[PDB]
Amino acid sequence: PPNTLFLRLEGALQSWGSNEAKFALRRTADAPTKSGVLGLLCAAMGIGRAEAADSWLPKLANLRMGVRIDRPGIRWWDFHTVGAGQRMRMAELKAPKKPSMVGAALAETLTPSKVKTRAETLLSRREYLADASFLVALQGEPELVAKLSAALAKPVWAIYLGRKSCPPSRPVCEHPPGFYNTLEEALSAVPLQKRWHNEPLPQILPCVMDWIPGYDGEHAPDDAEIHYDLPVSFQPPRHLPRFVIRRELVVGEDVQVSRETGTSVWRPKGTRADYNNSEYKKVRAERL
Amino acid sequence: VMYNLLCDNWVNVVYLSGKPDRISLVQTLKDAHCLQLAYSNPMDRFTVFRFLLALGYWCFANTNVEPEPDKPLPVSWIPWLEENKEYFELFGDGKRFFQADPSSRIRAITDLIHEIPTAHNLCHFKHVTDYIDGLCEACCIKGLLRLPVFTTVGGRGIGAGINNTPPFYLLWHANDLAGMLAQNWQPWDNMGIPAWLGSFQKESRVGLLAGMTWLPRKVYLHDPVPGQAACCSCGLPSEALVYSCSIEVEPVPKGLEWKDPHGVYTDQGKSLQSKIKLMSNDRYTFADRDWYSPLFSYLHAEGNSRQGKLWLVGFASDKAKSIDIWDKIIELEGTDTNDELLAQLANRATALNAMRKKPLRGDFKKSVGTPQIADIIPHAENRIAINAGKMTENRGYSWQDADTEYGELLTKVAYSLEPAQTVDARLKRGNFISRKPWPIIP
Amino acid sequence: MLIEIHMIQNHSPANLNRDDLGAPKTCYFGGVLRSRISSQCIKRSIRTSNDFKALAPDIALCGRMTVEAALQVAHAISTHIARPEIDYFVAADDVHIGESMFASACFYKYFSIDWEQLVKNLKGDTNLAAHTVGAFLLAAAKTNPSGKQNSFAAHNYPDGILVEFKNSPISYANAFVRPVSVVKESDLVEQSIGQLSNYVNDIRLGVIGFWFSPNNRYPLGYKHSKLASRNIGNLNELVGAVLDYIGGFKW
Ligand SMILES: [Mg+2]
């Protein structure tokens, strides 16, 4: 039985936010983070946002994360405007004198007219990645992988690519799960696909892997990094740092290159019927 | 009701084995060599660091034992904070930590965060309602320790902190608690009185302990009222939180010659702050974070050239609103110095503005110029920016080696900007692909 | 069940969406630069418009402040290389030279509708959910952004819609990896729709779909293939066909 599933991510534009955005400047990461795929899988199964923290997030957070870079993106920026021609909601409320009544007791007296509105224009610039491909291969229990694959076969809710306007252009359920011992062999098992015949191909394909703790002890290596994308809660969000390493894989020795398997250009039909073909002479004779 | 930092757990750290946790100040002083400080925001990671820096400075002041590198911290540091247990308290009717006498200017505990909106701020990316949601004691401690270093102006009658505008904050990074503690140990003959001691006085015109822990504001921090949801800062499900308090503004007297070792000052003695915004105006073009500003400066006044990881913290502001804060890490060893090339590297954004602003043909006043180049600036900038520590010392990567990175994207642009099929079309594309940024020293 | 709408439209020289420097919005695709109209433009373009205003509607469809909106709009993308231009204009005194700029492109759009979330947000109402779906169809087929339309009167009308009821959300943006070159014996719209045809002819070889074209102008597929289930000649008839495939539903 297969023990690890495979997810394919591709779109015209994608973004995966980092820790370096606590204001209207939203920057993106180079690779799809763990929290993004966890959220997409929660959407595909159809778990509530208040329920993910109750025996549903750590169960999949125990899995091992593995990403392969088929082709990386061009860093792109889009200028965003909020509230053009309207009045926005502001956060101040009047001081309720005695500090004994606060919080939920104060929220019971809240009215729609108690809020105040301000007409302004909120400007932001959001970063997107253009023409990027990724594979997510999660190693877990064979039953858990079977449940995950069945859930992503038909998602309960709609799915997006980090932000709700980034559509899928290849099937996420394209790859059937398999049984492999290591994440490296699993990431090397799924082949590399070409779109059209003549294009640049990356000779090196970077991979992102979780750092195995090994035996009891075994302090973290000097080349490992930190990443704050282990979600504990989603409403309101709670995130946890993690250890991340980097490995590379050279093409042509452990990942093959698949063929084009299709046609790119469309082109009109064939005019110029041949007058020396036998069918032409037969039809001409019958018409005569 | 009763809260003490030495005993209660607030320090969000991550062990080197891979397990994050929240342990106390005493426990962080106890282990101190198998962990890293775990704080996603740069502000908290800098403030907890500076509080440990001040603690180690006071422990050396009253114990006179240095922390040896590649060793556990001295054991005699622990009992001195146990003896002075009354000076670290978060509540109670008496001596308080980062607090003073209460007042009547009642404000909720949300202004102590630069990222959680309050008052007239826009709560569009974080829906927060006043006197509804509050913070926990660990979050209260974290918001308390950020007043000394990120205090900007607050309008009419309210000033900034002791450093006026908070500049760049550059320091040296290492992979364990003793590692970074042991890279920034340089003491002074004058220490001062830190804020956790008795009632601080300006007295005459500072030092080391009193220099870092300046109090531009006083805080009340009433007892946690039984309001319940979970949290909003770190999202943790918790217990009764504090919701309302007091803040009064303490002006800084004139004079007070003080030099922050991590702070970066300009030629005139003004602060050197970040160069980022959300808009590409007539005098700015949006490229990336500005890691090139505090370089033809760190390399001559304070810090000099030394082997390690130079961590850059860039905190932007304008009036009373923060816009963007970022971090970065660069590798150096000290491979000589060319003062002219470092100067050109300190002045790069004007070169990018001049490259963007060039007209396609002819010349016109108030001409914006080639806005697709403004779209492709960030990609080549981020492809260049990986070897910032190699461009700084000029080991193998040069201005001309950095110049070649623009060619692919720019040849992609030239097809769109001249989508014709003439000899003149390809010749204009060839002239267009020879556009390179030019260095400007002053 | 997800109802997915495929959308090809041509547009006259104009500038509907611009950035801070004013440039026509542009993404990167297929090794070159692509003309771009934001999805957050089509939202607040279709939304708050007069034609669309025909349990409360316009809240279950598109949200405002855990609303869980059931409509998803993607970024429109050109089917050829972006070709921007800059216009030179002068001012009179009737008693200095500036620059304005514009772009012209044919865009592919993509619309997706979650039926189950729409029914759940209607408190069990079903005729209202299909009513709102139809209303969004008639709005989206006849809505443009209100950009620089006084000077560039860009009021073009579409040239083909294909509607899908597939199991999982999937776009056809990968059909336009190769930029479209115009040949003498065709045009831009015909070659774009043919490139859309030789990507739905695949996949199944390697679901159903209703198709409409106005008075059957540019028929889908350049053979007699059954790549679309039915080819229809009216917008109302296509909407009625969508409602009919949802169930017994009259318009
Ligand atoms: Mg908190």
PDB file of N, CA and C in Angstrom, chain B residues 132-180:
ATOM      1  N   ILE B 132     -12.505  45.215  23.690  1.00  0.00           N
ATOM      2  CA  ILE B 132     -13.147  43.926  23.459  1.00  0.00           C
ATOM      3  C   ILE B 132     -12.115  42.812  23.617  1.00  0.00           C
ATOM      4  N   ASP B 133     -10.922  43.004  23.055  1.00  0.00           N
ATOM      5  CA  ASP B 133      -9.874  41.992  23.078  1.00  0.00           C
ATOM      6  C   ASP B 133      -8.612  42.540  23.731  1.00  0.00           C
ATOM      7  N   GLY B 134      -7.901  41.670  24.449  1.00  0.00           N
ATOM      8  CA  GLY B 134      -6.728  42.069  25.209  1.00  0.00           C
ATOM      9  C   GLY B 134      -5.550  41.128  25.059  1.00  0.00           C
ATOM     10  N   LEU B 135      -4.498  41.349  25.847  1.00  0.00           N
ATOM     11  CA  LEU B 135      -3.246  40.613  25.730  1.00  0.00           C
ATOM     12  C   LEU B 135      -2.905  39.896  27.032  1.00  0.00           C
ATOM     13  N   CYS B 136      -2.085  38.853  26.908  1.00  0.00           N
ATOM     14  CA  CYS B 136      -1.625  38.089  28.058  1.00  0.00           C
ATOM     15  C   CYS B 136      -0.364  38.719  28.646  1.00  0.00           C
ATOM     16  N   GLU B 137       0.050  38.207  29.810  1.00  0.00           N
ATOM     17  CA  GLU B 137       1.158  38.805  30.553  1.00  0.00           C
ATOM     18  C   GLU B 137       2.475  38.694  29.794  1.00  0.00           C
ATOM     19  N   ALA B 138       2.711  37.565  29.120  1.00  0.00           N
ATOM     20  CA  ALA B 138       3.884  37.448  28.258  1.00  0.00           C
ATOM     21  C   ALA B 138       3.845  38.479  27.135  1.00  0.00           C
ATOM     22  N   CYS B 139       2.674  38.655  26.517  1.00  0.00           N
ATOM     23  CA  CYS B 139       2.507  39.697  25.511  1.00  0.00           C
ATOM     24  C   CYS B 139       2.639  41.090  26.114  1.00  0.00           C
ATOM     25  N   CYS B 140       2.185  41.275  27.360  1.00  0.00           N
ATOM     26  CA  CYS B 140       2.370  42.554  28.042  1.00  0.00           C
ATOM     27  C   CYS B 140       3.849  42.866  28.241  1.00  0.00           C
ATOM     28  N   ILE B 141       4.638  41.861  28.630  1.00  0.00           N
ATOM     29  CA  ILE B 141       6.079  42.034  28.801  1.00  0.00           C
ATOM     30  C   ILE B 141       6.742  42.363  27.473  1.00  0.00           C
ATOM     31  N   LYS B 142       6.352  41.659  26.414  1.00  0.00           N
ATOM     32  CA  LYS B 142       6.890  41.948  25.093  1.00  0.00           C
ATOM     33  C   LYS B 142       6.540  43.359  24.619  1.00  0.00           C
ATOM     34  N   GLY B 143       5.316  43.826  24.855  1.00  0.00           N
ATOM     35  CA  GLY B 143       4.948  45.171  24.453  1.00  0.00           C
ATOM     36  C   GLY B 143       5.583  46.240  25.321  1.00  0.00           C
ATOM     37  N   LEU B 144       5.914  45.875  26.559  1.00  0.00           N
ATOM     38  CA  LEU B 144       6.614  46.782  27.454  1.00  0.00           C
ATOM     39  C   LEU B 144       8.039  47.056  26.999  1.00  0.00           C
ATOM     40  N   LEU B 145       8.761  46.035  26.542  1.00  0.00           N
ATOM     41  CA  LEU B 145      10.174  46.176  26.225  1.00  0.00           C
ATOM     42  C   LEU B 145      10.430  46.823  24.871  1.00  0.00           C
ATOM     43  N   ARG B 146       9.385  47.159  24.116  1.00  0.00           N
ATOM     44  CA  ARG B 146       9.569  47.779  22.812  1.00  0.00           C
ATOM     45  C   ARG B 146       9.457  49.295  22.853  1.00  0.00           C
ATOM     46  N   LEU B 147       8.916  49.852  23.934  1.00  0.00           N
ATOM     47  CA  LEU B 147       8.930  51.302  24.117  1.00  0.00           C
ATOM     48  C   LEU B 147      10.322  51.938  24.105  1.00  0.00           C
ATOM     49  N   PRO B 148      11.387  51.352  24.684  1.00  0.00           N
ATOM     50  CA  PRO B 148      12.702  52.017  24.600  1.00  0.00           C
ATOM     51  C   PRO B 148      13.271  52.181  23.192  1.00  0.00           C
ATOM     52  N   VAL B 149      12.909  51.344  22.220  1.00  0.00           N
ATOM     53  CA  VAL B 149      13.656  51.342  20.962  1.00  0.00           C
ATOM     54  C   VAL B 149      12.814  51.692  19.738  1.00  0.00           C
ATOM     55  N   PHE B 150      11.502  51.454  19.789  1.00  0.00           N
ATOM     56  CA  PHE B 150      10.668  51.818  18.643  1.00  0.00           C
ATOM     57  C   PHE B 150       9.590  52.826  19.007  1.00  0.00           C
ATOM     58  N   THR B 151       9.972  53.886  19.701  1.00  0.00           N
ATOM     59  CA  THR B 151       9.049  54.951  20.064  1.00  0.00           C
ATOM     60  C   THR B 151       9.217  56.096  19.069  1.00  0.00           C
ATOM     61  N   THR B 152       8.227  56.270  18.196  1.00  0.00           N
ATOM     62  CA  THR B 152       8.179  57.390  17.272  1.00  0.00           C
ATOM     63  C   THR B 152       7.259  58.470  17.841  1.00  0.00           C
ATOM     64  N   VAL B 153       7.091  59.561  17.095  1.00  0.00           N
ATOM     65  CA  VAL B 153       6.259  60.662  17.563  1.00  0.00           C
ATOM     66  C   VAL B 153       4.789  60.256  17.521  1.00  0.00           C
ATOM     67  N   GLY B 154       3.984  60.933  18.337  1.00  0.00           N
ATOM     68  CA  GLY B 154       2.582  60.590  18.471  1.00  0.00           C
ATOM     69  C   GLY B 154       1.630  61.729  18.174  1.00  0.00           C
ATOM     70  N   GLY B 155       2.119  62.763  17.495  1.00  0.00           N
ATOM     71  CA  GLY B 155       1.267  63.873  17.114  1.00  0.00           C
ATOM     72  C   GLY B 155       1.660  65.196  17.735  1.00  0.00           C
ATOM     73  N   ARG B 156       0.729  65.814  18.456  1.00  0.00           N
ATOM     74  CA  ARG B 156       0.938  67.116  19.079  1.00  0.00           C
ATOM     75  C   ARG B 156       1.240  66.914  20.558  1.00  0.00           C
ATOM     76  N   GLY B 157       2.406  67.388  20.993  1.00  0.00           N
ATOM     77  CA  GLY B 157       2.808  67.283  22.378  1.00  0.00           C
ATOM     78  C   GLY B 157       3.388  65.947  22.786  1.00  0.00           C
ATOM     79  N   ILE B 158       3.537  65.005  21.858  1.00  0.00           N
ATOM     80  CA  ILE B 158       4.080  63.682  22.149  1.00  0.00           C
ATOM     81  C   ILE B 158       5.296  63.470  21.261  1.00  0.00           C
ATOM     82  N   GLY B 159       6.439  63.180  21.878  1.00  0.00           N
ATOM     83  CA  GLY B 159       7.679  63.009  21.157  1.00  0.00           C
ATOM     84  C   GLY B 159       7.976  61.557  20.834  1.00  0.00           C
ATOM     85  N   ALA B 160       9.206  61.333  20.390  1.00  0.00           N
ATOM     86  CA  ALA B 160       9.722  60.005  20.102  1.00  0.00           C
ATOM     87  C   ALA B 160      10.432  59.459  21.340  1.00  0.00           C
ATOM     88  N   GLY B 161      11.210  58.396  21.164  1.00  0.00           N
ATOM     89  CA  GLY B 161      12.020  57.854  22.235  1.00  0.00           C
ATOM     90  C   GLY B 161      13.289  58.657  22.443  1.00  0.00           C
ATOM     91  N   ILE B 162      14.269  58.015  23.084  1.00  0.00           N
ATOM     92  CA  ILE B 162      15.524  58.698  23.386  1.00  0.00           C
ATOM     93  C   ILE B 162      16.386  58.843  22.138  1.00  0.00           C
ATOM     94  N   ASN B 163      16.147  58.024  21.118  1.00  0.00           N
ATOM     95  CA  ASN B 163      16.920  58.066  19.886  1.00  0.00           C
ATOM     96  C   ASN B 163      16.237  58.868  18.788  1.00  0.00           C
ATOM     97  N   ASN B 164      15.145  59.567  19.114  1.00  0.00           N
ATOM     98  CA  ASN B 164      14.300  60.300  18.162  1.00  0.00           C
ATOM     99  C   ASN B 164      13.789  59.292  17.141  1.00  0.00           C
ATOM    100  N   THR B 165      14.114  59.421  15.860  1.00  0.00           N
ATOM    101  CA  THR B 165      13.692  58.421  14.885  1.00  0.00           C
ATOM    102  C   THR B 165      14.499  57.141  15.071  1.00  0.00           C
ATOM    103  N   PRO B 166      13.850  55.991  15.226  1.00  0.00           N
ATOM    104  CA  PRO B 166      14.577  54.722  15.315  1.00  0.00           C
ATOM    105  C   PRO B 166      15.218  54.358  13.987  1.00  0.00           C
ATOM    106  N   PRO B 167      16.547  54.250  13.949  1.00  0.00           N
ATOM    107  CA  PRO B 167      17.241  53.931  12.695  1.00  0.00           C
ATOM    108  C   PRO B 167      17.317  52.436  12.413  1.00  0.00           C
ATOM    109  N   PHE B 168      18.128  52.075  11.412  1.00  0.00           N
ATOM    110  CA  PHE B 168      18.606  50.707  11.242  1.00  0.00           C
ATOM    111  C   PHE B 168      19.141  50.155  12.556  1.00  0.00           C
ATOM    112  N   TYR B 169      19.010  48.844  12.734  1.00  0.00           N
ATOM    113  CA  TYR B 169      19.578  48.152  13.887  1.00  0.00           C
ATOM    114  C   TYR B 169      20.381  46.963  13.382  1.00  0.00           C
ATOM    115  N   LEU B 170      21.696  47.141  13.281  1.00  0.00           N
ATOM    116  CA  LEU B 170      22.603  46.114  12.786  1.00  0.00           C
ATOM    117  C   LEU B 170      23.337  45.482  13.955  1.00  0.00           C
ATOM    118  N   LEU B 171      23.422  44.158  13.939  1.00  0.00           N
ATOM    119  CA  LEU B 171      24.160  43.416  14.944  1.00  0.00           C
ATOM    120  C   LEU B 171      24.650  42.123  14.311  1.00  0.00           C
ATOM    121  N   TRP B 172      25.300  41.300  15.125  1.00  0.00           N
ATOM    122  CA  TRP B 172      25.951  40.081  14.676  1.00  0.00           C
ATOM    123  C   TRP B 172      25.228  38.855  15.209  1.00  0.00           C
ATOM    124  N   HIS B 173      24.944  37.917  14.315  1.00  0.00           N
ATOM    125  CA  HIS B 173      24.086  36.784  14.609  1.00  0.00           C
ATOM    126  C   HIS B 173      24.913  35.530  14.865  1.00  0.00           C
ATOM    127  N   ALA B 174      24.398  34.677  15.748  1.00  0.00           N
ATOM    128  CA  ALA B 174      25.012  33.389  16.034  1.00  0.00           C
ATOM    129  C   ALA B 174      23.924  32.414  16.467  1.00  0.00           C
ATOM    130  N   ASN B 175      24.274  31.130  16.455  1.00  0.00           N
ATOM    131  CA  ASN B 175      23.305  30.042  16.430  1.00  0.00           C
ATOM    132  C   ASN B 175      22.920  29.522  17.813  1.00  0.00           C
ATOM    133  N   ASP B 176      23.437  30.115  18.889  1.00  0.00           N
ATOM    134  CA  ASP B 176      23.070  29.713  20.242  1.00  0.00           C
ATOM    135  C   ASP B 176      23.107  30.944  21.138  1.00  0.00           C
ATOM    136  N   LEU B 177      22.516  30.815  22.335  1.00  0.00           N
ATOM    137  CA  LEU B 177      22.313  31.979  23.199  1.00  0.00           C
ATOM    138  C   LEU B 177      23.647  32.579  23.647  1.00  0.00           C
ATOM    139  N   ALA B 178      24.601  31.722  24.021  1.00  0.00           N
ATOM    140  CA  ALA B 178      25.945  32.199  24.319  1.00  0.00           C
ATOM    141  C   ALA B 178      26.649  32.721  23.075  1.00  0.00           C
ATOM    142  N   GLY B 179      26.238  32.273  21.886  1.00  0.00           N
ATOM    143  CA  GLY B 179      26.938  32.683  20.677  1.00  0.00           C
ATOM    144  C   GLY B 179      26.769  34.159  20.388  1.00  0.00           C
ATOM    145  N   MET B 180      25.527  34.617  20.374  1.00  0.00           N
ATOM    146  CA  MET B 180      25.249  36.030  20.203  1.00  0.00           C
ATOM    147  C   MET B 180      25.577  36.848  21.454  1.00  0.00           C
TER     148      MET B 180
END
